[PDB]
Design a protein around this ligand. Sequence first.
Ligand SMILES: *[C@@H]1O[C@H](CO)[C@@H](O[C@@H]2O[C@H](CO)[C@@H](O)[C@H](O)[C@H]2NC(C)=O)[C@H](O)[C@H]1NC(C)=O
Lengths: 49, 49
Amino acid sequence: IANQFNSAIGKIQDSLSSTASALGKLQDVVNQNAQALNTLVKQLSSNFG
Amino acid sequence: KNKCVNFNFNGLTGTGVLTESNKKFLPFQQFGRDIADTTDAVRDPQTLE
Ligand SMILES: *[C@@H]1O[C@H](CO)[C@@H](O[C@@H]2O[C@H](CO)[C@@H](O)[C@H](O)[C@H]2NC(C)=O)[C@H](O)[C@H]1NC(C)=O
């Protein structure tokens, strides 16, 4: 049972090294804020007639 | 330089700290701009820098 647990934590090293794909849920949140800040900044160029 | 001022370059009035730029503008360019469309940098009309 300890060898199962130690193996299973071992697989988390490989999963979290190899890609961002699981953390994509947190990436989406920081990326949405960066996109909205950059949009409110780009709207300063709007000439509004 | 290096002090906040009410600048005006050729009619491009504004408030800022002025500093020497490593940015290399082309001869056809007198001003630069931010992603926000504010005047980021200027080529001085009497000393070509
Ligand atoms: C239950 O399954 C585990 C694997 O999850 C079996 O453990 C393996 O057993 C073989 C020898 O039969 C070893 O070569 C492996 O190294 C063992 N793995 C680990 C993680 O120790 C276990 O034999 C199975 N038990 C029963 C009663 O079926």
